[PDB]
Design a protein around this ligand. Structure first.
Ligand SMILES: [Cl-]
Ligand SMILES: [Cl-]
Ligand SMILES: [Cl-]
Lengths: 242, 255, 250
């Protein structure tokens, strides 16, 4: 039983659906733990392919802005330990992992796209990482992945300067596999994924592994560096005023 | 020795050297330039010849309507004394060595992609210096459909060149690209209309071959040398994986 | 402090370093190498949030000045390779967001350094040319590493090895340039954006850049060193000796 996700599995696809549509799928502490539990189950289940998507209008508005005796410094520590573990589940996820981006995506839900195998977007999806505007720094391994996927010249605009991308721009810049018109989005994506799930399953998993294994150690080191820096930013005056 | 004069005779290739350019042409056009055991070996020989001749630039291209359908699946081989296992090992050693020749090739190496390209002939494109395509070339790596895994260093190069989100569709899910898509995604340098393709590309290559010859070579070396060690390790790892996949049920059934 | 070949200003949280030999298409002479390094050193310590590099007049920069003793040509190529190395090293290490405002044609080292910038904005009149091979030379500015990664090997080759000159639109499509603007609106569009950028939280800007760049710097410094070594030799080859005399003639 999940309180913040709807998780199903059938015919070789596991579907993990963010389910706080009244909060535009903001990721609160509970959803952090539950996404990790869903991923850990999906890593051992019978599915060939695992899909993340959002209920409703938004894919996700990112971290929930609403969440101790040992202080703001110890809440910072425990939040960093948790972020690091959460990102770690995406670095390690051993099967094909697909984002179906049904609408606007923000923050950590965008930065994680650099660790997904494929990303399909509705043309009403947008991609925004306004870290800078909130006195914070990158996470989700995006400090490593975004310059490499997008080019430094483009990644700067998104990561440092908080420019919001359209679906088309995110696709042209390598974050998004393909964009579909919103009225046909759901059909186009599921039809494709159902075909993909009929491919030889050990071949799909083994092909992902030969692509991803040699990079994991570096991604885990990137993730640890990001979380350490981010712990600092949370305790900063710019983060508080913003 | 691999010395020759103007043309080097092969059974599955046409190998010629004029205007400072050694041209290696797949020549099993009836079989869509499918690469059999004989062609793996002749290609490695042709590359050794090309690295040592007086060409400035080297081209790989196909005869007829296809660049290459990739590995020849009609090329059925007897099982040797150590069984299908020994056969999978033998084949893995040969692939590793074949890819290694592309990793190490020291002159500018250009692909002239005249028509459809499949498999190993596509994955190798990530080790090339330039790739020119006809607008009727297509690019297809249907490894998963055959119960196999990536080779040619593509498990490393394609994500980096195309982005992970585009490389996945091609490598894991077997999507076939048009020439325009392959160029948009970084694998192809430039696409030309089929009707003037050969004219335009060869005009350009003949110009390039008149550039200061040693500078061409030294610049490629400064770009490529520091990566070769990693590429070699990637190739070895892909070949070890594939050795296991060739013995799998999924691979058998797929044939 | 005080500049012969640059104009350096600072306002609205932006330090602007402008190449200032417009009668030589902002060619970079030995003096400008040393000045750019002193300017970047100062900009790194001043209270600006963003630093910009641009060129005065019609060119960004035509790149190295070909006009450029005690141990003859042997020890000279050595000095020049030591200076090139130090010059490129300042870009690798520069700690604040570094932006290129490419006002017209760029050539040579002015192009290759763009792989070390944070953002790059171009006028549609700008072009990008690295004719190193034509000149009998090899790559620098870390371009041997950075350009295949940014542009794809297949496109980097055409630039670096074969001397293709890119339009602003092509450079942008291939990852080198952030955004291209019509020449008539370029200055206004860029500076408006940059002025808004300079108002974002400055420690977040600086620290974001740091988490992006820091872990790559070692590698970049190695690539720089290797490139300067090769180039030290190329400068003493018949193809370069010979090419430089032909360009003397232009
Ligand atoms: Cl957190
Ligand atoms: Cl084989
Ligand atoms: Cl110099």
């Amino acid at each position: 039983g999940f309180e913040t996700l709807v998780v199903t599995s059938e015919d070789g696809i596991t579907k993990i659906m963010f389910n706080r549509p009244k909060k535009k799928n903001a990721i609160n502490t509970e959803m952090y733990h539950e996404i990790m539990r869903a991923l850990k189950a999906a890593s051992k289940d019978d599915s060939i392919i695992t899909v993340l998507t959002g209920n409703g209008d938004y894919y996700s508005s990112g971290n929930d802005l609403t969440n101790p005796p040992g202080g703001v410094e110890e809440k910072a520590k425990n939040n960093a330990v948790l972020l690091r573990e959460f990102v770690g589940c995406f670095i390690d996820f051993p099967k094909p992992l697909i984002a179906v981006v049904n609408g606007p995506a923000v923050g950590i839900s965008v930065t994680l796209l650099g660790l997904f195998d494929a990303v399909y977007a509705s043309d009403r999806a947008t991609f925004h990482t306004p870290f800078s505007h909130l006195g914070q720094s990158p996470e989700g391994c995006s400090s490593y992945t975004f310059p490499k996927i997008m080019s430094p010249a483009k990644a700067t605009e998104m990561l440092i300067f908080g420019k919001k991308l359209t679906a088309g721009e995110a696709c042209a810049q390598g974050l998004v596999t393909e964009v579909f018109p919103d009225s046909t989005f759901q059909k186009e994506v599921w039809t494709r994924l159902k075909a993909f799930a009929k491919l030889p399953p050990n071949a799909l998993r083994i092909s992902k592994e030969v692509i991803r294994k040699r990079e994991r150690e570096k991604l885990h080191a990137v993730n640890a560096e990001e979380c350490n820096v981010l712990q600092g930013r949370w305790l900063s005056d710019e983060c508080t005023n913003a």
